[PDB]
Design a protein that fits this description.
Largest sheet: 5 strands, mixed
CATH superfamily: Doublecortin domain
CATH class: Alpha Beta
Structural class: alpha+beta
Distance between the termini: 26 Å
Radius of gyration: 15 Å
Number of strands: 5
Number of domains: 1
CATH topology: Ubiquitin-like (UB roll)
Order of helices and strands: EEHEEE
Shape: globular
Strand order of the largest sheet: 2-1-5-3-4
Oligomer: monomer
CATH architecture: Roll
Strand content: 15-25%
Length: about 110
Amino acid sequence: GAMDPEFALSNEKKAKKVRFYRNGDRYFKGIVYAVSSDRFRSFDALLADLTRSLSDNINLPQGVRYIYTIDGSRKIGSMDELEEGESYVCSSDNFFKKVEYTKNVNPNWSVNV
């Protein structure tokens, strides 16, 4: 029958797929996370989940306090700056390390739809 399906009968496209990397890892290809208005009310909420998901008590003391651009030129403050299939770096108290965050890496992560 069909009373009330959760997620298996027609669904609109929303949110944004990003590959999150933790500043200073190199070997770590990062973790993919989805972001929208229904999941995260703001960057602060994302950072909350990011801290827990990317937590490593190594290069990320408090998990994740801020999110920087793949280059680290500027840190994002609003979700409106996060675009689909985007690559971000997690920062807290570091000067951002310019590594092969996506050099020679398979960018087929943003294609699981």
